[PDB]
Amino acid sequence: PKQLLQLRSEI
Amino acid sequence: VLPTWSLDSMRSRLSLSEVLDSGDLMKFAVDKTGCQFLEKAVKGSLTSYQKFQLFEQVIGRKDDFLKLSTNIFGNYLVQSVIGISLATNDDGYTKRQEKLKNFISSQMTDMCLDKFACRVIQSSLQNMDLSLACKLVQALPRDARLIAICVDQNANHVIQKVVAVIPLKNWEFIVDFVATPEHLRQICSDKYGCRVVQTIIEKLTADSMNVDLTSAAQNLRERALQRLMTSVTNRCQELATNEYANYIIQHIVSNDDLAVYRECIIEKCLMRNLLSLSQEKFASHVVEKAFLHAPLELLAEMMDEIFDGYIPHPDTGKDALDIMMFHQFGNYVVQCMLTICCDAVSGRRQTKEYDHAISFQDWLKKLHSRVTKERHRLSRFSSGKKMIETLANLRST
RNA sequence: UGUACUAU
């Protein structure tokens, strides 16, 4: 199984 | 299955000339006991006529040469007789080597795919005169049969031998064939096909083993490396996560003489995917290699992605460090990050490429602070025990 | 606590 997290922005 | 005149109620005083004169050599060469005797017999003292008979009976008749080359025992005798022919500089030396190439060229693909005949191909590629060995490369197939050669457990070594002992100008078509995207996908999805690609990449690298090349040869080598590397980095994500091709991405990322392709690999498929790839069985090794050899400006972006690149879980508060530290594959990436930071502040790794020494202290302080707060949970695992002891030996020094 | 290849 994988535990994925939302990425932040790069601006 | 041996002729009865030689059988014993094989004799003891059976000479090689008895076998050569009898015309029954093909029977001995396919029998285990007989071919073992012929193996030792051709190593002794040979007269000019005895060599002449061996040259005609073993590598002089195409159909017999093919039958022996594809034989479990006979292929050893063919390699031995080929060696004797190459070592006999008499008036027939040129005619024999020319005929031997035609025998091999006329059945290149069938001999390559054969378990035993491919050994005869490899022996001829590295032992015949370079002018004659290049003619063998031209006989290689250019269609799907080349793929079948690259992914065969035995035939793949023929291409490897070509790469090792033949100048690049003769097999540059193999690079373009492998660089074809559909061919790269099929070849790099196979365990033996990856070995072919790995050997080609090593040969096309301007490392210590290629300083003997001329300028023209180096320029030809750099052109082939760029064409293959371009096709490799376009499938970078597929190869980095593949069960076999992940070793190739590790090599490109870790090899010093391929450092300009480090940046290409990391930004194309690793950046903004570190947390996901760190949790994969195969891609996690690539992430490890990337952290270890990345340039300092790119290493900072990688570290900042793990430390501050992801939004924590909205229910539990787990961040990327919390996930990787206790994942069965991600924990190795964190150990690698800690080892890198500990080596930098201890003088084992140069920090100076700006001076990123203060950058390594920030990352170490982050890792130390997290390991301190989670020491109880980490002490349950071997990975956490390593991390706690890694930080422990630093404080002593 | 975690992968290939090294083929008669």
> In Å, how far is A11's CA from the nearest CA of chain B?
13
Asked whether B74 and B68 are in contact (CB, 8 A), the reply is yes
**Residue B214, domain extent:** 1-397
* Deposited experimental method: X-ray
Positions of strand C less than 7 angstroms from a protein CB: 1-8
Asked whether B22 and B47 are in contact (CB, 8 A), the reply is no
Documented resolution in Å: 2.3
The secondary structure of B144-192 as a DSSP string is HHHHHHHTSTTTHHHHHHHHHHS-HHHHHHHHHHHHSHHHHHHHHTSHH
DSSP state at residue B14: -
Give CA separation, B27 vs B4, B31, B43, in Å: 11, 7, 19
Is the Cβ atom of B348 within 7 Å of strand C at any atom? no
Q: What is the spatial distance between Cα B299 and Cα B284, in angstroms, rounded to a whole number?
A: 16
Is the Cβ atom of B195 within 7 Å of strand C at any atom? yes
Closest residue by Cα to residue B28 from B17, B18, B38, B41:
B38
DSSP state at residue B225: H
Q: What is the spatial distance between Cα B354 and Cα B27, in angstroms, rounded to a whole number?
A: 76
Closest residue by Cα to residue B61 from B45, B81, B47:
B81
Counting the structural domains of chain B, the total is: 1
Q: Which residue of A has its CA nearest to B279?
A: A2
Give me the long-range contacts of B142-150 (CB less than 8 A, separation at least 24).
B142/B173, B142/B177, B145/B109, B145/B113, B146/B174, B146/B177, B147/B183, B147/B186, B147/B187, B147/B193, B148/B113, B149/B109, B149/B112, B149/B113, B150/B178, B150/B187, B150/B190, B150/B192, B150/B193, B150/B196
Q: Which residue of A has its CA nearest to B272?
A: A7
Give CA separation, B304 vs B193, B276, B297, B328, in Å: 36, 15, 11, 22
Q: What is the spatial distance between Cα B158 and Cα B171, in angstroms, rounded to a whole number?
A: 12
Which nucleotide is at minimal CA–C1' distance from B278?
A: C2
Does B308 sit within 8 Å of A3, measured CB to CB? Answer: no
Does B309 sit within 8 Å of A8, measured CB to CB? Answer: yes
Which residue's alpha carbon is at the shortest distance from the C1' of C7? B154
